[PDB]
């Protein structure tokens, strides 16, 4: 079976991260059998030593000599740590000299929560492990590749990272999806810079063959949380009771008593009815509203949304008797998950790690591909959200009427003209009651206060300085000015103008640093994640995520980084749109792109510029004007969530 | 170099069409060296015999025996002929029994004209050779593959056939592009049906290494045609002279005299000035307007657009002295073409046919991919048009004002509700002067006349029966009711409901026939091509191409065929949009999709249905309301052409 493989990569040196198991271990194995010298990096020394032994034993069996010189390991390697990645590269270059192939395979599942349950530090950790690590190793190894005149960077992404012009929603996995999309986007935008000496591609395997009760149980506990949270948020909107008083109705922990209470809000009585109808009579979840675990995670959502409740509100919650969910409900949801994955597959057969690695090692022999995403497995039935539509007009007069009397939050700093035009559109054209302008710095606040002096003097434009504490700034806005209806989130920072690759004979000293690439992710991805999380938790009606602006005079490097961010953020927008849709959250989340693919598409004169700024206002109004609630059908609801439009 | 290849496909039988040369000859060669038995089909016997000899000689050299039994040829095989494809399959199955791999490689360049210069029979010929041939061979060979429990269909498409969710405009190549897109779309939609026994994928190589003066000269002759045609059409719109009288200004064939004529229309005097400024003083094209060849092709455009001119109008045109274009202008355009192709490549190196075939033969070993398009070469800088945006509202009141007093042409038959709602929107809401309803049959005409009785009785709705003569029907409309402003083109026919695959142990007697697949292309692709060609030639202001309707009750087979058509037509729309943009044609051409990917996205109740039909009217108005001509900037012009939106 190895006959077609032996000799294919003879003389090559490969670094494989995550090389102790999974597809990474198999790529390491087959590259070694193909004749490459390999460094396998991973955390667990013991698993790495076993993999190294098996590969060395197989090389000896097919007739390699000095097998200890052909397979090295780098144990205790956590790719989320920049220091550990520098140590990995020093260890690899000491062992083998210049790396030919960087196989950026290492990956973690990430937080595995909905965005509104996702710790900000957990999201950042996923980006460090899964995405920033891929740039960091490229930044250290590409200079040596360019100097020797050849190299290959392969980022191991996923089908769930999307594809060119299409995002793939991955609910409960936004951190992972964005990381996977960023791995592909890095190949798409760096290929022109790294050519002609270096190839950069991604692989995006689908599901591969590699507890299921415990996951099905978490799905059911998550559904109970979502149903309770959505009804409490909906009730609080139109009831005179505070959220504290609404949550008190839950404390007897009695479904039938909540359903039958004529003074309970309709959203809570209808929910109680659903718990009885859809419930298993042998499950305590059919007669009790929640348990302490769901209660704690619900209280965290409410607290994270600026709702005022005492920390001990659930201290005396009656404990429902086991089972909360029956083995029958848990097993039915587990079959639904499993059957869901198997029904994705056109070929009705799960690919093996071995088969994917084999297709990958054949693919690495191709010298005429860069910027591409290879699907070593595929044929998948799954939802996709096309991105990059440019032909739109205004929303309906019915949706625009819903802006009258509204509280608008605008977030930004660098895009002062956009922010001014938006504030004035919402206030002067569409009868918003007030705009809260949330900027990064006092200097930004003063720039906006001078641009909007008339509305400031009239009490219609309030300014808040967020710095690096956007969630506390939004809490200040909720407390002082009221919860937001429409929200527009622009980036505080412009894109950097440093080189993305170095001259062949240079040290690359000025080239985008590992720390600068992290900062890019912080300012252009994490910023929107933090706002989306906080705004959804705080019951905002709508949220436009706005990418950085490219113009006819942007540097080629700014175009590359802009498109990196635009592609990567599409994964976020698509995922959180579907997560929100499927959990009955009102909020509409969509993306408005100020980034284009090519300078030739940008406005060239003042007239075309005016056209562009009018399209920007139109685009933001198209995604932020709320749906009159009768129009939020299943059909219209899916259209107005998780989409991106290009100005 | 063959060491990794020998044994990879041992025991397989492959049919390769176009197997005498190019990538096809190399795939044939490398599959044989890999251990496959191959049938190579092509037209020229002599080239096939040479290829067969070289491959047989190389097999003998690497140690195969009985090499005459391993490489057969099928000369005189024209894949555009259904009879010849049946003969090919009989010949192949006699030689080898069941085919494992169908390599649908054969392809022609096609007409290589803009749509408005493309004979309808030439377009049909391209579809027969390049697309319908791929279904025809699959229809004959898949039953045997399914019966034996395994098979592979590979369609050799092109990067210029686009990708999932993105069309790639290929000006002067609409027939080729649509054929290439259809090859990919066939893999995308058939994979679920052909699984699990059969894999179907496409390959989409970019430019490959495989007169250039003569092509550069045709580019310059084509530019002169386009500039003259655009100015005559523009002038005729707002001058009281007939096109015949406008063309008389050209007969002295004197650039300076046309520029200096104070009574000549501004569009023609400005064009004459451009010919002098941009011209080579040593070229006769700088002092003469045209030559007999350009004159004949111009007269054909005008005649094909229903303009009345005598056939001999150019009989006495003075012949400009050679050179019309200097070697200097021809060589500069040839360098521009060449440099254009080389500047597409991130890797700055042209892939070889050998390298692409090698990557392809490795790819064929992967058993876990279906429905995919593999790029064996790639890393290309080129324009793309994302498709499948669903979030749009109405066009601007300024664009809607431009509908007042307009002549609207609606084409269709099956979608009677859509046609009624459109006629009534344009007439009752947007003050169109008249609607010409162009249907296929008398029964369709009578259905629409009864639905629109009020507007019929009032003289606002005229009905024409086109049958299979849509161009003559449009000529009747021009003559009797005046040239069209906005035009909406819906398909006459619904999608068929026959099976797309047969049961394993059946003869497949009821499965979509080769003739039925041709008819699908005729009704759902050629229909829109014929209308686009005729409407652009006839100076229509705008054209919406509308795909077939899928609903929550469409058969799974109708969803597959709908999506086939939607993807394939996107290639057409994107190509003709850019062709029109780049040749200064006014007309706006865009696509409105009534087809969705999945039944779950379709409306489920009467309310969602009303929402959907309102979105349809909005979408058609968004692409058909003309631009007030000051707004048709370079920037706004590219936005409003070649796009697709999904209702």
């Amino acid at each position: 079976w190895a006959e077609s493989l032996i000799g294919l990569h003879l003389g090559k040196v490969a670094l494989i991260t995550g090389g102790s198991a999974g597809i990474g271990g198999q790529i390491g194995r087959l590259l070694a059998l193909s004749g490459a010298r390999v460094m396998l990096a991973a955390r667990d020394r013991h698993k790495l030593e076993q993999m190294q032994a098996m590969i060395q034993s197989e090389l000896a069996e097919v007739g390699y000599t000095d097998v200890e010189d052909r397979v090295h390991i780098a144990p205790g390697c956590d790719v989320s740590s920049e220091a550990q990645l520098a140590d990995l590269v020093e260890r690899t270059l000491s062992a083998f000299g210049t790396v030919d192939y960087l196989i950026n395979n290492a990956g973690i599942a990430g937080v595995e929560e909905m965005v509104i349950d996702m710790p900000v530090e957990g999201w950042r950790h996923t980006l460090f492990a899964n995405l920033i690590s891929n740039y960091s190793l490229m930044r250290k190894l590409a200079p040596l590749m360019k100097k020797q005149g050849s190299g290959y960077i392969l980022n191991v992404s996923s089908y769930f990272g999307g594809e060119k012009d299409a995002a793939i929603p991955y609910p409960n996995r936004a951190d992972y999806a964005v990381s996977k999309a960023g791995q592909r986007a890095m190949a798409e935008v760096f290929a022109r810079f790294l050519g002609p000496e270096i190839q950069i591609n991604a692989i995006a395997p689908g599901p591969v063959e590699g507890l299921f009760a415990r996951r099905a149980r978490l799905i059911l506990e998550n559904k109970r949380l979502n149903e309770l949270h959505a009804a409490l948020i909906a009730a609080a909107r139109t009831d005179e009771r505070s959220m504290h008083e609404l949550v008190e109705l839950l404390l007897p922990n009695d479904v039938a008593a909540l359903e039958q209470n004529p003074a309970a809000p309709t959203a809570l009585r209808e929910l109680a009815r659903r718990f009885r109808s859809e419930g298993d009579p042998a499950a305590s979840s059919s007669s009790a509203l929640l348990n302490r675990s769901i209660a704690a995670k619900l209280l965290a959502r409410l607290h994270n949304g600026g709702y005022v409740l005492p920390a001990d509100i659930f201290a005396n919650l009656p404990n429902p008797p086991d089972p909360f969910f029956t083995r029958a409900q848990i097993d039915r949801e587990a079959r639904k998950v499993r059957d869901g994955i198997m029904g994705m597959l056109y070929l009705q057969r799960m690919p093996t790690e071995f088969d994917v690695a084999m297709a990958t090692v054949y693919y690495l022999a191709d010298r005429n591909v860069s910027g591409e995403t290879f699907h070593p497995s595929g044929g998948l039935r799954y939802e996709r959200t096309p991105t990059g539509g440019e032909l739109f007009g205004l929303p309906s007069p019915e949706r625009l009427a819903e802006l009258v009397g509204s509280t608008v939050y605008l977030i930004g700093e660098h895009l002062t003209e956009h922010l001014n035009l938006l504030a004035r559109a919402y206030l002067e054209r569409y009868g918003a009651r007030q705009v809260v302008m949330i900027v990064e710095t006092e200097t930004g606040a003063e720039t906006m206060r001078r641009l909007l002096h008339d509305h400031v003097e009239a009490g219609r434009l309030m300014t808040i300085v967020a710095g690096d504490q956007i969630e506390a700034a939004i809490d200040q806005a909720i407390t002082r000015y009221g919860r937001p209806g429409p929200v527009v989130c622009t980036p505080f920072r412009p894109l950097p103008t440093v080189p993305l690759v170095g001259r062949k004979d240079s040290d690359w000293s000025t080239v985008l640093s590992e720390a600068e690439f992290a900062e890019l992710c912080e300012h252009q991805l994490t910023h929107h994640f933090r706002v989306a999380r906080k705004i959804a938790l705080s019951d905002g009606a709508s949220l436009a995520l706005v990418t950085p602006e490219t113009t006819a005079t942007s540097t080629t490097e700014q175009f590359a980084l802009a498109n990196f961010i635009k592609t990567t953020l599409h994964a976020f927008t698509a995922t959180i749109g579907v997560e929100s849709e499927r959990t009955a959250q009102r909020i509409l989340i969509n993306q408005v792109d100020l980034t284009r693919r090519a300078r030739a598409e940008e406005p060239r004169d003042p007239h075309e510029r005016q056209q562009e700024l009018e399209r920007f206002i139109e685009a933001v109004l198209l995604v932020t004007a709320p749906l009159p609630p009768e129009a939020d059908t299943r059909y219209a609801g899916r259209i107005h969530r998780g989409r991106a439009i290009t100005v």
Side-chain angles (χ1 to χ4, degrees), chain A:
Chain A
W1 65 258
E3 287 195 38
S4 269
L5 195 52
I6 306 303
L8 192 61
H9 301 288
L10 189 63
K12 293 295 205 284
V13 169
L15 176 55
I16 304 87
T17 63
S20 71
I23 291 161
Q26 294 303 299
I27 289 168
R29 175 193 190 190
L30 299 182
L31 277 172
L33 286 174
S34 79
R37 297 190 295 158
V38 303
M39 177 65 79
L40 309 175
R43 295 254 246 159
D44 191 60
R45 173 191 304 283
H46 171 70
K47 216 203 316 282
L48 255 183
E49 286 171 342
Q50 297 176 281
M51 189 48 79
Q52 170 186 51
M54 180 274 310
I55 297 175
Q56 285 176 353
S57 177
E58 204 182 13
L59 297 183
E61 204 162 0
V62 302
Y64 291 95
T65 61
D66 301 341
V67 297
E68 300 82 5
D69 299 337
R70 303 184 80 81
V71 192
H72 285 211
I73 58 165
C77 183
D78 179 347
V79 297
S80 80
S81 160
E82 178 53 27
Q84 293 186 45
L85 288 180
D87 192 78
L88 178 52
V89 165
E90 177 187 12
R91 176 177 186 84
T92 303
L93 293 178
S94 299
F96 301 135
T98 292
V99 176
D100 299 297
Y101 300 163
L102 170 59
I103 311 297
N104 270 323
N105 172 73
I108 66 171
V111 178
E112 302 189 87
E113 299 284 353
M114 292 168 62
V115 169
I116 57 171
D117 302 313
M118 176 177 292
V120 176
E121 268 309 313
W123 156 279
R124 285 201 183 100
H125 181 69
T126 301
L127 293 197
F128 271 104
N130 282 11
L131 175 58
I132 294 158
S133 65
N134 285 214
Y135 182 79
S136 170
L137 286 175
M138 167 172 82
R139 183 51 175 80
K140 294 167 178 50
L141 292 176
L144 283 175
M145 288 174 179
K146 191 173 187 172
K147 174 70 178 330
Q148 78 165 9
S150 71
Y152 203 122
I153 302 165
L154 188 75
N155 296 343
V156 182
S157 180
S158 166
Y159 166 84
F160 299 101
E163 248 287 18
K164 292 186 185 182
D165 309 296
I168 297 184
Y170 205 23
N172 299 43
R173 302 296 304 277
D175 56 330
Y176 182 83
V178 162
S179 79
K180 297 297 107 182
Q183 283 179 298
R184 168 172 57 81
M186 187 186 303
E188 294 173 357
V189 307
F190 276 87
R192 57 181 175 99
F193 294 91
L194 290 168
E197 300 92 353
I198 300 165
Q199 295 175 270
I200 181 170
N201 295 296
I203 61 153
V208 178
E209 285 184 23
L211 196 269
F212 287 95
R214 275 56 164 289
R215 280 186 199 168
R217 198 203 70 187
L218 265 43
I219 292 168
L220 294 182
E221 289 168 352
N222 188 64
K223 181 179 127 85
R224 176 54 63 97
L225 170 65
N226 283 329
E227 289 173 353
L228 289 161
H229 181 246
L232 283 171
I233 296 300
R237 219 175 272 146
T238 56
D239 198 277
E240 285 231 357
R241 287 165 280 196
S242 68
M243 184 59 75
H244 181 2
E245 281 160 350
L246 292 171
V247 168
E248 276 160 13
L249 294 169
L250 302 187
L251 295 189
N253 205 8
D254 184 334
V255 169
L258 177 56
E259 183 176 4
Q260 284 155 8
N261 177 353
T266 303
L268 289 174
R269 298 181 74 186
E270 280 176 0
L271 178 72
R273 180 177 172 89
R274 288 174 33 83
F275 291 168
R276 202 158 183 179
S277 290
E278 294 178 3
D280 178 342
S284 69
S285 64
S286 69
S287 57
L289 287 168
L290 70 181
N291 63 19
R292 299 289 182 93
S293 177
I294 298 166
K297 200 162 172 181
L298 172 62
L299 184 59
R301 284 195 183 182
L302 291 173
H303 276 155
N304 291 339
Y307 292 95
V308 177
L309 299 86
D312 64 357
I313 188 157
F314 290 124
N316 301 136
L317 186 74
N319 297 303
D322 301 323
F324 191 67
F325 297 114
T326 57
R327 278 184 297 184
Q329 293 173 294
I330 291 165
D331 293 349
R332 173 170 312 100
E333 179 66 31
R335 294 192 298 281
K336 182 158 207 254
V337 168
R338 170 198 77 184
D339 291 352
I341 292 167
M342 290 308 306
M344 286 179 75
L345 299 165
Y346 295 155
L347 294 173
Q348 300 171 23
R349 174 179 34 80
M350 191 65 58
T352 69
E353 291 171 342
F354 176 82
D355 286 340
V356 167
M358 182 69 61
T360 299
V361 177
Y362 288 149
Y363 181 68
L364 287 167
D366 186 337
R367 292 285 161 271
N368 293 312
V369 289
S370 198
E372 300 289 338
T373 303
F374 177 54
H375 303 266
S377 67
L380 300 175
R381 178 188 155 167
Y382 199 83
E383 67 187 339
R384 50 199 308 111
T385 308
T387 56
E390 294 176 47
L391 187 51
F392 57 80
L394 272 172
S396 61
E398 288 86 353
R399 291 176 65 201
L400 288 174
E402 294 280 315
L403 292 175
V404 182
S406 65
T407 300
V408 177
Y409 290 9
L410 299 182
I411 300 163
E413 174 124 334
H414 178 251
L415 297 177
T416 61
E417 188 178 6
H418 289 80
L419 290 165
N420 186 27
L421 285 170
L422 276 176
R424 296 183 171 290
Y426 281 112
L427 288 172
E428 293 171 18
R429 309 222 290 269
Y430 298 108
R433 178 167 65 82
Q434 51 176 350
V435 169
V436 186
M437 181 72 61
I438 302 177
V439 302
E440 186 184 7
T441 73
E442 184 71 31
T443 295
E446 192 61 9
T447 301
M448 296 312 307
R449 284 189 297 246
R450 298 188 120 261
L451 285 172
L452 292 163
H453 61 106
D454 48 327
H455 291 291
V456 171
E457 186 72 356
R460 284 181 299 260
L461 193 286
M462 330 302 306
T463 59
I464 281 169
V465 174
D468 70 359
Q469 304 244 96
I470 191 56
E471 303 87 352
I474 287 164
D475 278 332
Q476 283 285 325
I478 290 166
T479 302
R480 288 153 50 186
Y481 307 123
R483 297 184 172 276
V487 177
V488 186
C489 182
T490 72
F492 288 153
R493 305 299 185 87
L495 291 173
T497 51
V498 297
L500 298 182
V501 295
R503 284 170 300 102
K504 185 191 183 116
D505 292 319
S506 74
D507 58 7
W508 287 45
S509 66
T510 70
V511 179
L512 189 75
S513 76
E514 302 93 332
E516 287 169 336
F517 183 81
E519 292 162 17
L520 178 71
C521 293
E522 180 68 32
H523 297 312
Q524 305 299 333
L525 302 170
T526 303
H527 173 77
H528 294 293
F529 155 71
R530 287 170 69 182
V531 173
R533 171 177 171 289
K534 181 66 180 182
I535 294 299
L537 279 163
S538 303
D539 194 24
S542 68
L543 176 62
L545 305 180
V546 182
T547 52
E549 183 192 34
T550 56
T551 76
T553 65
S554 290
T555 74
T556 195
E557 289 87 5
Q558 283 173 319
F559 270 96
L561 295 185
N563 277 285
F564 170 77
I565 290 311
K566 170 175 173 177
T567 296
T568 305
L569 195 66
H570 285 154
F572 181 68
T573 298
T575 298
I576 199 178
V578 171
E579 273 186 11
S580 304
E581 197 280 336
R582 288 187 189 172
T583 57
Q585 295 183 57
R586 174 179 70 164
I587 186 174
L588 304 182
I589 310 179
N590 298 284
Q591 185 176 329
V592 173
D593 290 310
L594 289 186
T595 288
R596 282 176 171 276
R597 217 195 291 270
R599 177 184 323 276
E601 302 172 26
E602 301 288 8
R604 288 164 154 98
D605 64 40
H607 183 201
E608 296 185 339
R609 172 64 166 178
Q610 174 184 196
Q611 286 182 319
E612 178 181 55
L613 292 169
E614 182 54 20
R615 283 175 51 78
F616 172 66
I617 298 304
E618 291 181 359
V620 168
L621 285 165
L622 183 58
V623 300
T624 57
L627 285 180
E630 47 168 9
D632 198 353
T633 51
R634 183 180 204 96
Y635 172 73
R638 299 191 169 193
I639 294 167
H640 288 97
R641 295 174 170 88
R643 313 279 165 195
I645 51 189
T646 301
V647 175

